[PDB]
Structure formats: structure tokens, C-alpha cells
PDB file of C-alpha atoms in Angstrom:
ATOM      1  CA  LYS A   1      14.972-194.958 267.057  1.00  0.00           C
ATOM      2  CA  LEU A   2      13.411-192.902 270.014  1.00  0.00           C
ATOM      3  CA  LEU A   3      14.954-190.087 268.995  1.00  0.00           C
ATOM      4  CA  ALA A   4      11.744-188.287 268.887  1.00  0.00           C
ATOM      5  CA  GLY A   5      10.982-184.814 267.232  1.00  0.00           C
ATOM      6  CA  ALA A   6      14.923-182.909 267.440  1.00  0.00           C
ATOM      7  CA  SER A   7      17.551-184.116 268.582  1.00  0.00           C
ATOM      8  CA  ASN A   8      21.350-182.966 268.533  1.00  0.00           C
ATOM      9  CA  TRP A   9      24.053-184.901 266.554  1.00  0.00           C
ATOM     10  CA  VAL A  10      28.538-183.410 267.090  1.00  0.00           C
ATOM     11  CA  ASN A  11      31.377-184.448 264.743  1.00  0.00           C
ATOM     12  CA  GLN A  12      34.712-185.394 264.826  1.00  0.00           C
ATOM     13  CA  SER A  13      35.427-181.642 263.366  1.00  0.00           C
ATOM     14  CA  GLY A  14      32.472-180.063 265.961  1.00  0.00           C
ATOM     15  CA  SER A  15      30.433-179.730 262.803  1.00  0.00           C
ATOM     16  CA  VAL A  16      26.803-179.949 263.739  1.00  0.00           C
ATOM     17  CA  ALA A  17      23.294-182.095 262.560  1.00  0.00           C
ATOM     18  CA  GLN A  18      20.189-181.326 264.049  1.00  0.00           C
ATOM     19  CA  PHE A  19      17.838-183.494 263.156  1.00  0.00           C
ATOM     20  CA  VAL A  20      13.877-183.334 262.876  1.00  0.00           C
ATOM     21  CA  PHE A  21      12.582-187.166 261.383  1.00  0.00           C
ATOM     22  CA  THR A  22       8.872-187.973 259.700  1.00  0.00           C
ATOM     23  CA  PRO A  23       7.391-190.889 258.507  1.00  0.00           C
ATOM     24  CA  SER A  24       7.462-191.273 254.934  1.00  0.00           C
ATOM     25  CA  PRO A  25       3.019-192.273 254.252  1.00  0.00           C
ATOM     26  CA  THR A  26       4.301-194.952 251.351  1.00  0.00           C
ATOM     27  CA  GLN A  27       7.530-196.247 252.638  1.00  0.00           C
ATOM     28  CA  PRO A  28       7.613-199.496 255.072  1.00  0.00           C
ATOM     29  CA  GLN A  29       9.701-198.179 258.319  1.00  0.00           C
ATOM     30  CA  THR A  30      11.191-194.998 256.183  1.00  0.00           C
ATOM     31  CA  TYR A  31      11.663-191.293 258.116  1.00  0.00           C
ATOM     32  CA  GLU A  32      12.291-188.052 255.424  1.00  0.00           C
ATOM     33  CA  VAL A  33      14.919-186.761 257.275  1.00  0.00           C
ATOM     34  CA  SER A  34      14.426-182.302 257.518  1.00  0.00           C
ATOM     35  CA  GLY A  35      16.299-180.196 260.509  1.00  0.00           C
ATOM     36  CA  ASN A  36      19.842-177.885 259.641  1.00  0.00           C
ATOM     37  CA  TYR A  37      23.830-179.058 259.052  1.00  0.00           C
ATOM     38  CA  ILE A  38      25.982-176.168 261.015  1.00  0.00           C
ATOM     39  CA  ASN A  39      29.197-176.757 259.450  1.00  0.00           C
ATOM     40  CA  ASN A  40      32.447-175.524 262.318  1.00  0.00           C
ATOM     41  CA  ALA A  41      35.673-177.290 260.408  1.00  0.00           C
ATOM     42  CA  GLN A  42      38.481-174.835 260.763  1.00  0.00           C
ATOM     43  CA  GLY A  43      40.117-174.750 257.463  1.00  0.00           C
ATOM     44  CA  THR A  44      36.190-174.729 255.365  1.00  0.00           C
ATOM     45  CA  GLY A  45      34.288-172.058 254.442  1.00  0.00           C
ATOM     46  CA  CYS A  46      30.401-171.251 254.851  1.00  0.00           C
ATOM     47  CA  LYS A  47      30.473-171.660 258.916  1.00  0.00           C
ATOM     48  CA  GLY A  48      28.725-171.283 261.350  1.00  0.00           C
ATOM     49  CA  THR A  49      25.557-170.504 259.982  1.00  0.00           C
ATOM     50  CA  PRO A  50      22.379-172.966 259.345  1.00  0.00           C
ATOM     51  CA  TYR A  51      22.363-174.839 256.160  1.00  0.00           C
ATOM     52  CA  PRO A  52      19.232-177.378 255.747  1.00  0.00           C
ATOM     53  CA  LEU A  53      19.406-180.751 255.053  1.00  0.00           C
ATOM     54  CA  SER A  54      17.062-183.283 253.512  1.00  0.00           C
ATOM     55  CA  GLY A  55      17.073-187.398 253.393  1.00  0.00           C
ATOM     56  CA  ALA A  56      15.809-190.456 254.272  1.00  0.00           C
ATOM     57  CA  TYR A  57      15.812-192.958 257.218  1.00  0.00           C
ATOM     58  CA  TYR A  58      15.199-196.333 257.455  1.00  0.00           C
ATOM     59  CA  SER A  59      14.428-197.131 261.253  1.00  0.00           C
ATOM     60  CA  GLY A  60      14.090-201.245 261.299  1.00  0.00           C
ATOM     61  CA  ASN A  61      18.017-201.749 261.184  1.00  0.00           C
ATOM     62  CA  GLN A  62      18.765-197.473 261.430  1.00  0.00           C
ATOM     63  CA  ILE A  63      20.056-196.421 258.153  1.00  0.00           C
ATOM     64  CA  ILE A  64      20.155-192.499 256.777  1.00  0.00           C
ATOM     65  CA  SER A  65      21.221-190.683 253.746  1.00  0.00           C
ATOM     66  CA  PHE A  66      21.625-187.437 253.564  1.00  0.00           C
ATOM     67  CA  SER A  67      22.313-184.040 251.829  1.00  0.00           C
ATOM     68  CA  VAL A  68      22.714-179.940 252.078  1.00  0.00           C
ATOM     69  CA  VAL A  69      23.706-177.533 249.229  1.00  0.00           C
ATOM     70  CA  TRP A  70      26.019-175.034 250.756  1.00  0.00           C
ATOM     71  CA  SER A  71      23.808-172.160 249.859  1.00  0.00           C
ATOM     72  CA  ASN A  72      22.126-170.130 252.914  1.00  0.00           C
ATOM     73  CA  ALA A  73      21.761-166.262 253.429  1.00  0.00           C
ATOM     74  CA  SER A  74      24.616-165.829 255.087  1.00  0.00           C
ATOM     75  CA  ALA A  75      27.383-167.518 252.821  1.00  0.00           C
ATOM     76  CA  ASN A  76      27.592-169.986 249.574  1.00  0.00           C
ATOM     77  CA  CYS A  77      30.033-172.214 248.315  1.00  0.00           C
ATOM     78  CA  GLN A  78      28.520-173.685 245.430  1.00  0.00           C
ATOM     79  CA  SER A  79      28.969-177.745 246.153  1.00  0.00           C
ATOM     80  CA  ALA A  80      26.756-180.291 247.747  1.00  0.00           C
ATOM     81  CA  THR A  81      27.566-182.642 250.588  1.00  0.00           C
ATOM     82  CA  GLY A  82      26.263-185.786 250.485  1.00  0.00           C
ATOM     83  CA  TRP A  83      25.704-188.607 253.305  1.00  0.00           C
ATOM     84  CA  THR A  84      25.417-191.749 253.943  1.00  0.00           C
ATOM     85  CA  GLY A  85      25.645-193.953 256.731  1.00  0.00           C
ATOM     86  CA  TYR A  86      24.333-196.150 260.156  1.00  0.00           C
ATOM     87  CA  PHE A  87      23.808-195.835 263.211  1.00  0.00           C
ATOM     88  CA  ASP A  88      24.926-198.317 267.036  1.00  0.00           C
ATOM     89  CA  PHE A  89      22.340-196.314 269.761  1.00  0.00           C
ATOM     90  CA  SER A  90      23.770-199.441 271.800  1.00  0.00           C
ATOM     91  CA  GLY A  91      26.019-198.826 275.162  1.00  0.00           C
ATOM     92  CA  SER A  92      26.175-195.588 277.778  1.00  0.00           C
ATOM     93  CA  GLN A  93      26.689-193.292 273.820  1.00  0.00           C
ATOM     94  CA  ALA A  94      24.823-193.202 270.787  1.00  0.00           C
ATOM     95  CA  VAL A  95      26.951-192.846 267.909  1.00  0.00           C
ATOM     96  CA  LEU A  96      26.481-192.004 264.007  1.00  0.00           C
ATOM     97  CA  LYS A  97      28.907-193.259 261.672  1.00  0.00           C
ATOM     98  CA  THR A  98      29.104-191.728 257.666  1.00  0.00           C
ATOM     99  CA  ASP A  99      30.513-192.162 254.658  1.00  0.00           C
ATOM    100  CA  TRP A 100      31.187-189.258 252.332  1.00  0.00           C
ATOM    101  CA  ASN A 101      31.000-187.219 249.094  1.00  0.00           C
ATOM    102  CA  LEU A 102      30.784-184.032 247.738  1.00  0.00           C
ATOM    103  CA  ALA A 103      30.782-181.487 244.231  1.00  0.00           C
ATOM    104  CA  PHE A 104      33.566-179.399 244.561  1.00  0.00           C
ATOM    105  CA  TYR A 105      34.595-176.488 242.417  1.00  0.00           C
ATOM    106  CA  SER A 106      38.737-175.900 241.558  1.00  0.00           C
ATOM    107  CA  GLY A 107      37.973-174.163 238.909  1.00  0.00           C
ATOM    108  CA  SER A 108      35.962-175.348 235.996  1.00  0.00           C
ATOM    109  CA  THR A 109      37.415-179.021 236.832  1.00  0.00           C
ATOM    110  CA  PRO A 110      34.129-179.968 239.111  1.00  0.00           C
ATOM    111  CA  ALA A 111      35.124-182.457 240.504  1.00  0.00           C
ATOM    112  CA  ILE A 112      34.264-185.274 243.466  1.00  0.00           C
ATOM    113  CA  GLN A 113      35.933-185.754 246.959  1.00  0.00           C
ATOM    114  CA  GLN A 114      34.917-188.040 249.394  1.00  0.00           C
ATOM    115  CA  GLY A 115      35.658-188.367 253.303  1.00  0.00           C
ATOM    116  CA  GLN A 116      33.895-189.699 256.417  1.00  0.00           C
ATOM    117  CA  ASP A 117      32.050-188.341 259.209  1.00  0.00           C
ATOM    118  CA  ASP A 118      31.288-189.790 262.396  1.00  0.00           C
ATOM    119  CA  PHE A 119      28.822-188.010 264.474  1.00  0.00           C
ATOM    120  CA  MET A 120      27.817-188.543 268.580  1.00  0.00           C
ATOM    121  CA  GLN A 121      24.090-188.200 269.861  1.00  0.00           C
ATOM    122  CA  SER A 122      24.657-184.704 272.998  1.00  0.00           C
ATOM    123  CA  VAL A 123      21.370-183.776 274.463  1.00  0.00           C
ATOM    124  CA  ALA A 124      20.949-179.700 274.908  1.00  0.00           C
ATOM    125  CA  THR A 125      22.980-177.905 277.792  1.00  0.00           C
ATOM    126  CA  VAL A 126      21.127-176.471 279.987  1.00  0.00           C
ATOM    127  CA  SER A 127      21.955-172.701 281.488  1.00  0.00           C
ATOM    128  CA  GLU A 128      19.575-170.760 284.118  1.00  0.00           C
ATOM    129  CA  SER A 129      19.622-167.597 281.440  1.00  0.00           C
ATOM    130  CA  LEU A 130      22.118-167.079 278.348  1.00  0.00           C
ATOM    131  CA  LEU A 131      24.264-164.910 280.504  1.00  0.00           C
ATOM    132  CA  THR A 132      24.964-167.752 282.253  1.00  0.00           C
ATOM    133  CA  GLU A 133      27.004-171.052 281.317  1.00  0.00           C
TER     134      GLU A 133
ATOM    135  CA  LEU B   1      16.053-177.121 231.530  1.00  0.00           C
ATOM    136  CA  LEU B   2      14.343-178.288 234.145  1.00  0.00           C
ATOM    137  CA  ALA B   3       8.556-183.344 235.655  1.00  0.00           C
ATOM    138  CA  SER B   4      11.573-184.568 234.179  1.00  0.00           C
ATOM    139  CA  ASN B   5      13.062-188.373 233.213  1.00  0.00           C
ATOM    140  CA  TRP B   6      16.950-189.029 234.065  1.00  0.00           C
ATOM    141  CA  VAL B   7      17.739-192.677 231.950  1.00  0.00           C
ATOM    142  CA  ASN B   8      21.783-194.422 233.991  1.00  0.00           C
ATOM    143  CA  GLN B   9      24.025-196.782 232.398  1.00  0.00           C
ATOM    144  CA  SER B  10      21.220-200.104 233.643  1.00  0.00           C
ATOM    145  CA  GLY B  11      18.099-198.568 232.396  1.00  0.00           C
ATOM    146  CA  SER B  12      17.329-197.402 236.102  1.00  0.00           C
ATOM    147  CA  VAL B  13      14.923-193.787 236.124  1.00  0.00           C
ATOM    148  CA  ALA B  14      14.898-190.910 238.494  1.00  0.00           C
ATOM    149  CA  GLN B  15      12.248-189.065 238.118  1.00  0.00           C
ATOM    150  CA  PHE B  16      13.196-185.374 239.808  1.00  0.00           C
ATOM    151  CA  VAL B  17      10.746-182.305 240.546  1.00  0.00           C
ATOM    152  CA  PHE B  18      12.071-179.208 241.476  1.00  0.00           C
ATOM    153  CA  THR B  19      10.844-177.238 243.494  1.00  0.00           C
ATOM    154  CA  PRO B  20      12.088-173.635 245.360  1.00  0.00           C
ATOM    155  CA  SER B  21      14.217-173.539 248.634  1.00  0.00           C
ATOM    156  CA  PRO B  22      11.649-170.820 250.683  1.00  0.00           C
ATOM    157  CA  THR B  23      15.522-169.761 251.900  1.00  0.00           C
ATOM    158  CA  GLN B  24      18.790-171.421 250.168  1.00  0.00           C
ATOM    159  CA  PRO B  25      19.597-168.889 247.037  1.00  0.00           C
ATOM    160  CA  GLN B  26      19.738-170.841 243.552  1.00  0.00           C
ATOM    161  CA  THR B  27      18.956-173.761 245.915  1.00  0.00           C
ATOM    162  CA  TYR B  28      15.837-176.125 245.165  1.00  0.00           C
ATOM    163  CA  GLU B  29      14.196-179.474 247.421  1.00  0.00           C
ATOM    164  CA  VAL B  30      14.203-182.606 244.821  1.00  0.00           C
ATOM    165  CA  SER B  31      11.837-184.712 245.300  1.00  0.00           C
ATOM    166  CA  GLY B  32      10.727-187.278 242.630  1.00  0.00           C
ATOM    167  CA  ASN B  33      10.708-191.105 242.137  1.00  0.00           C
ATOM    168  CA  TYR B  34      13.528-193.629 241.050  1.00  0.00           C
ATOM    169  CA  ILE B  35      13.038-196.634 239.483  1.00  0.00           C
ATOM    170  CA  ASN B  36      15.572-199.740 240.014  1.00  0.00           C
ATOM    171  CA  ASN B  37      16.530-201.398 236.727  1.00  0.00           C
ATOM    172  CA  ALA B  38      19.973-203.359 238.380  1.00  0.00           C
ATOM    173  CA  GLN B  39      20.977-206.248 237.210  1.00  0.00           C
ATOM    174  CA  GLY B  40      22.390-208.538 240.170  1.00  0.00           C
ATOM    175  CA  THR B  41      19.835-206.272 242.208  1.00  0.00           C
ATOM    176  CA  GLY B  42      17.099-206.908 245.065  1.00  0.00           C
ATOM    177  CA  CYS B  43      14.351-204.273 244.637  1.00  0.00           C
ATOM    178  CA  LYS B  44      13.740-203.378 241.248  1.00  0.00           C
ATOM    179  CA  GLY B  45      11.240-201.383 238.626  1.00  0.00           C
ATOM    180  CA  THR B  46       8.700-200.352 241.578  1.00  0.00           C
ATOM    181  CA  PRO B  47       8.848-196.383 242.532  1.00  0.00           C
ATOM    182  CA  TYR B  48      11.500-195.364 245.059  1.00  0.00           C
ATOM    183  CA  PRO B  49      10.633-191.517 246.666  1.00  0.00           C
ATOM    184  CA  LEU B  50      13.406-189.671 246.704  1.00  0.00           C
ATOM    185  CA  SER B  51      14.649-186.620 248.115  1.00  0.00           C
ATOM    186  CA  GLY B  52      17.460-184.207 248.228  1.00  0.00           C
ATOM    187  CA  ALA B  53      19.015-180.281 247.138  1.00  0.00           C
ATOM    188  CA  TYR B  54      19.675-178.990 243.482  1.00  0.00           C
ATOM    189  CA  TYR B  55      22.010-176.491 243.302  1.00  0.00           C
ATOM    190  CA  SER B  56      21.381-174.400 240.280  1.00  0.00           C
ATOM    191  CA  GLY B  57      24.580-171.631 240.159  1.00  0.00           C
ATOM    192  CA  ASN B  58      26.021-174.926 238.508  1.00  0.00           C
ATOM    193  CA  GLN B  59      24.251-177.467 238.248  1.00  0.00           C
ATOM    194  CA  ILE B  60      25.054-179.495 241.213  1.00  0.00           C
ATOM    195  CA  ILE B  61      22.650-182.006 243.079  1.00  0.00           C
ATOM    196  CA  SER B  62      22.968-184.500 245.998  1.00  0.00           C
ATOM    197  CA  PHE B  63      19.881-186.901 246.685  1.00  0.00           C
ATOM    198  CA  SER B  64      18.812-190.387 248.313  1.00  0.00           C
ATOM    199  CA  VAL B  65      16.896-192.983 248.494  1.00  0.00           C
ATOM    200  CA  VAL B  66      15.587-195.633 250.705  1.00  0.00           C
ATOM    201  CA  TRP B  67      15.053-199.493 249.684  1.00  0.00           C
ATOM    202  CA  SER B  68      11.753-199.648 250.830  1.00  0.00           C
ATOM    203  CA  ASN B  69       8.412-199.003 249.505  1.00  0.00           C
ATOM    204  CA  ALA B  70       5.083-201.576 249.211  1.00  0.00           C
ATOM    205  CA  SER B  71       6.673-204.329 246.638  1.00  0.00           C
ATOM    206  CA  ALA B  72       9.991-204.736 247.963  1.00  0.00           C
ATOM    207  CA  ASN B  73      12.355-203.754 251.315  1.00  0.00           C
ATOM    208  CA  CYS B  74      16.372-204.115 250.888  1.00  0.00           C
ATOM    209  CA  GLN B  75      16.983-202.875 254.015  1.00  0.00           C
ATOM    210  CA  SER B  76      19.522-200.257 253.272  1.00  0.00           C
ATOM    211  CA  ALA B  77      19.750-196.315 251.005  1.00  0.00           C
ATOM    212  CA  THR B  78      22.081-195.371 248.411  1.00  0.00           C
ATOM    213  CA  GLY B  79      23.198-191.739 248.205  1.00  0.00           C
ATOM    214  CA  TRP B  80      23.997-190.228 245.121  1.00  0.00           C
ATOM    215  CA  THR B  81      25.953-186.054 244.766  1.00  0.00           C
ATOM    216  CA  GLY B  82      27.227-185.699 241.779  1.00  0.00           C
ATOM    217  CA  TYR B  83      26.366-182.564 238.534  1.00  0.00           C
ATOM    218  CA  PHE B  84      24.386-182.343 235.301  1.00  0.00           C
ATOM    219  CA  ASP B  85      25.994-181.092 231.710  1.00  0.00           C
ATOM    220  CA  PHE B  86      22.695-179.707 229.541  1.00  0.00           C
ATOM    221  CA  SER B  87      25.168-178.697 226.788  1.00  0.00           C
ATOM    222  CA  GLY B  88      25.559-180.628 223.168  1.00  0.00           C
ATOM    223  CA  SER B  89      22.415-182.742 221.896  1.00  0.00           C
ATOM    224  CA  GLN B  90      22.098-184.513 224.149  1.00  0.00           C
ATOM    225  CA  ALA B  91      21.769-183.665 228.617  1.00  0.00           C
ATOM    226  CA  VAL B  92      24.101-185.454 230.875  1.00  0.00           C
ATOM    227  CA  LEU B  93      23.972-186.417 234.797  1.00  0.00           C
ATOM    228  CA  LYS B  94      27.541-187.505 236.652  1.00  0.00           C
ATOM    229  CA  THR B  95      27.051-188.559 239.784  1.00  0.00           C
ATOM    230  CA  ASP B  96      29.951-190.921 242.037  1.00  0.00           C
ATOM    231  CA  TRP B  97      27.023-192.952 244.930  1.00  0.00           C
ATOM    232  CA  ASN B  98      27.316-194.810 248.280  1.00  0.00           C
ATOM    233  CA  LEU B  99      25.782-197.308 249.911  1.00  0.00           C
ATOM    234  CA  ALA B 100      25.101-198.270 253.642  1.00  0.00           C
ATOM    235  CA  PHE B 101      23.819-202.241 254.142  1.00  0.00           C
ATOM    236  CA  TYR B 102      24.249-205.068 256.691  1.00  0.00           C
ATOM    237  CA  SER B 103      25.738-208.596 255.901  1.00  0.00           C
ATOM    238  CA  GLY B 104      24.817-209.808 259.543  1.00  0.00           C
ATOM    239  CA  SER B 105      25.310-207.527 262.227  1.00  0.00           C
ATOM    240  CA  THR B 106      27.691-206.206 260.087  1.00  0.00           C
ATOM    241  CA  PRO B 107      26.913-202.293 259.275  1.00  0.00           C
ATOM    242  CA  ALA B 108      29.169-201.620 255.540  1.00  0.00           C
ATOM    243  CA  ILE B 109      29.097-198.811 252.467  1.00  0.00           C
ATOM    244  CA  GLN B 110      29.560-200.229 249.286  1.00  0.00           C
ATOM    245  CA  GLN B 111      30.538-196.966 246.676  1.00  0.00           C
ATOM    246  CA  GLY B 112      30.636-196.777 242.357  1.00  0.00           C
ATOM    247  CA  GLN B 113      29.220-194.622 239.746  1.00  0.00           C
ATOM    248  CA  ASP B 114      25.613-193.968 237.728  1.00  0.00           C
ATOM    249  CA  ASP B 115      26.015-191.300 234.509  1.00  0.00           C
ATOM    250  CA  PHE B 116      22.422-190.519 234.044  1.00  0.00           C
ATOM    251  CA  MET B 117      20.962-188.772 230.056  1.00  0.00           C
ATOM    252  CA  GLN B 118      17.382-187.074 229.992  1.00  0.00           C
ATOM    253  CA  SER B 119      15.622-188.008 227.582  1.00  0.00           C
ATOM    254  CA  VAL B 120      12.063-187.154 226.719  1.00  0.00           C
ATOM    255  CA  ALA B 121       8.827-188.752 227.398  1.00  0.00           C
ATOM    256  CA  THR B 122       8.102-190.350 224.093  1.00  0.00           C
ATOM    257  CA  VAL B 123       5.376-190.410 222.887  1.00  0.00           C
ATOM    258  CA  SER B 124       2.047-193.995 220.989  1.00  0.00           C
ATOM    259  CA  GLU B 125      -0.870-193.122 218.970  1.00  0.00           C
ATOM    260  CA  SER B 126      -1.866-195.152 222.338  1.00  0.00           C
ATOM    261  CA  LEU B 127      -1.628-197.897 225.123  1.00  0.00           C
ATOM    262  CA  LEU B 128      -1.103-200.689 222.800  1.00  0.00           C
ATOM    263  CA  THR B 129       0.073-199.392 219.559  1.00  0.00           C
ATOM    264  CA  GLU B 130       3.045-197.409 217.443  1.00  0.00           C
TER     265      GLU B 130
END
């Protein structure tokens, strides 16, 4: 906890989750999850533009579940991902480990694929301009 | 069409509210409350707020509950991801789900399936009868 305002989490395929947490008005130690997800996974669609996310986070044992619908002004992939997992802030690195489900289409055979993503916190790069570094 | 009441095979109830996303075409933000009725679980019979997103284009959804409210805490979170079928006599939502929790400093994630069916408000003549 005390990842504060906006924080940056990178998974093993280079995908980026920018979480924002707002306290739930009614749920003890629970925060509403907002922000944006940037998909960077190699063989996929809907890459490199922000998809808003929605979810909930329980600080008591640092658990989370969030979702993306893959529709925004750049690209539509007509699907939705739900991620559910837990954090470990200890040591030199903060890590979020997740299992996931994807409501999907092949033809009109609707289905749901499953998987795993592990994210690691990485704090903003500082460059002294947009043109250097 | 979807303010609407969806009942799963354990008697658990999802009351969805949908508000249009300002930036995502054919996408709605999912709010409302979830009431858990599942037999061998905690955190039963009280409202847990839910959060998610819904894509109208092919009627797909993903939503979440953190199992913490004023009645009961179960220190976990469920995420549900699936699709609707409005056709026929009955509207049905079919989902897969994942559940993050602890067992003894031991993080773990269980999974399963829930199928929900729409049922619109029953009308009684009063609270006392009929």
C-alpha cells in the first residue's frame, strides 16, 4: 500500500497498467480501481493505445480484480479481459501476480480464454527533455 | 434490454446499472450491487458493490467484487468475465470467474463458472402479502 496517486506496472509482454486508486465510500480498506491499460503484446490487436480500466482493490491483503473492454477511438477488438490477483511489495521490487479471463470471438463460437500475467512496478523514467533519452 | 436483476444457480443476485462510457464506443461502465447466496461461503446475503465494463456490440462483460462491506469481510476478490444471450423466453448471462485469497501467508487463486438468468421485479400487493 501507499503507492499513493498514479503508479506504473509493467508485465512480461511489455504491457502497461497505470492504476489510480480511489477509496470506496462504503467498503472498508477497499479502493475503486481506475486508470489506463496499454497493451504491448506481440501477436495481438488493440496495441499501443489507452484502454480504461475499472475494478476494485482490497488493501488489507493487497488483492485486486480489474477489467478492460477493448474498445476505444483507435481500435476495437470486441472483447473484454478480467484480471484477478495479488501484490507483493517486499524486497527491492514490487510485483503483482495475476490470473485472467478473456471473453472472446471465433466466428459465432463465443468463448473464454484464460492465462496469467505478472506485473512489476517501474517508476517514471526521467529525461531532461522529450528529445533526449 | 438493460436497474436489472440477474440470478445465478446458487441464488446469488447481481443488480447491474450501466452507464455509457464517455470515451469507449459501445461500452458501458458497470456499477450496482452483488448479493452472494452460495452455501459454503462467507459474506452472504448483504450487498457488495461491483465495478466493471460492458461491451454492447456483442454483449460481453467483465466485473468485480471485493468482499468487504459493513457486515462482513472475507479478504478476497472475485472477477467474473462472460457473455449474454437475450434470445428466446429467457435472458441468460454465462460467466467464468477467478477468486484471489489467502490461506496462511500463502496467496492463492480459485476458479469456476456462474450462469445468471434475468428475473424482473416480482410485484406483491404489499410488503405483508400477495
